[PDB]
């Protein structure tokens, strides 16, 4: 697998499969242009870690007959995760 690095606003580096990161149309544009690193000045590590779990969840469970479990979100991060999901279009 090609991996890409997604870097949070506080400098945490998340290394995820490229195919997983391409779940986000926004990330696809930042990697392709009109590099294998993307910096998110506005997404802290407690939010970007959850976005990466969402990518893993989505690729695992898309087109699956196996019963799908709930993607869990703590109340404390919901507002910031909503703003990140809105920017990332995922």
């Amino acid at each position: 697998m090609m991996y890409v690095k997604l870097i949070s606003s506080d400098g945490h580096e998340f290394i995820v499969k490229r195919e997983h990161a391409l779940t986000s149309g926004t990330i696809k544009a930042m990697l392709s242009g009109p590099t294998n690193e993307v910096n998110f000045r506005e997404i802290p590590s407690h939010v970007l870690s959850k976005v990466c779990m969402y990518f893993t969840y989505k690729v695992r469970y898309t087109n699956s007959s196996t019963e799908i479990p709930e993607f869990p979100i703590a109340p404390e991060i919901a507002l910031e995760l909503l703003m990140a999901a809105n920017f990332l279009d995922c």
Binding site: V51, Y54, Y57, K58, Y61, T62, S65, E67, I68, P69, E70, F71, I73, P75, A78, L79, L81, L82, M83, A84, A85, N86, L88, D89, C90
Partner: protein, 145 residues
Amino acid sequence: VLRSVNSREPSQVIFCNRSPRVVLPVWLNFDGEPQPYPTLPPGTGRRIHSYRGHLWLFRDAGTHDGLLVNQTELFVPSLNVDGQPIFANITLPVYTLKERCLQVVRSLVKPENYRRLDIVRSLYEDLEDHPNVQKDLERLTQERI
């Protein structure tokens, strides 16, 4: 356009709720009006008597979040072979991360208070635009043609 066909041909069905949600089954009547049926607790089944050509869809009873049935939006009972009931497996879809966040924020904030959250105005309108069967029937009729 989206309505049950009045076949009068009995079709036995198992509603199998394989979701963690309380499920609202909805029957599209012969005029296309949604009729709600009694809810199913999480991980439970119910034997129900329906008819060939009848249209059903399934929602979260509390929020009207969309659910899948046999991996699609609509369930149509068909012919029972050797008296075997038709399985309707009701599952969570893979919600977008955005729709999943809107669900959690709607679950925590009274709709009078959406306007008090510290977010862009476009996101207030996304919170306020709750899932609704009537909206989805409008969408589904246009996708039909």
